[PDB]
Amino acid sequence: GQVVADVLCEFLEVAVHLILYVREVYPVGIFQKRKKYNVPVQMSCHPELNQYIQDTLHCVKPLLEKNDVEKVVVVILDKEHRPVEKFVFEITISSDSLLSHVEQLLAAFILKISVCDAVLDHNPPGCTFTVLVHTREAVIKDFPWILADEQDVHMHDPRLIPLKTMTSDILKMQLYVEE
C-alpha cells in the first residue's frame, strides 16, 4: 500500500524530469546525470523547478496510497498554454537483484522515451508543462489544486504515438520450462 505509492511517486518525479529533458521543455544546461540510479537518468538541478515537481507529486502521494488515482498526465504546452504533448500514466513479482523496482519502472520508461526522441519533431521554443491528476470514480502550504480547464485537456486532433521499444522490433524473447 504505502510502498506502492512511494515507488510510484519516486518513479513519476524522475519521469517528469526525463520528459522535460528529452523534450527540451527547459534548456539542457539545467540538467545533470544522477548516479544514484543504476539506470541512466538526467534530472534538473534548478532548485525551484525541483521544489515544484516535488510539491506536486507529494500532493499526489496520499491519493496513490489508497488507489484513488486513475492517471497522472504530464502535459507539455506551448506558451499559448495549448497542450501539444500529453504523457499519460495510467494507474492499474521481480527480484531486486539487478534493478530495484523503481529502476525497473525507469528502465521501461527510458526505453519508451528514447524512441520518443526519434519519432517526434522538436517542440517550439518557450514550452512549459503542467501535471493533471485523474481520480477514479469514487496538503502542502500554499500549493493548492484547482479543477483543470477544458483548454489544457483537449486537442485539435490528437495522435496516439505508439512508442514501440527497440527490442520489440529486433527480438522476441520467450521462456519455456519443463513439466
Binding site: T56, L132, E137, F143, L147
Partner: peptide, 13 residues
C-alpha cells in the same frame, strides 16, 4: 474524477 492541476504554474527559467 477532476482532472486536477496545480493552481500555481511551473516556475520559469
Amino acid at each position: 474524477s477532476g482532472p486536477w492541476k496545480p493552481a500555481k504554474p511551473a516556475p520559469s527559467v
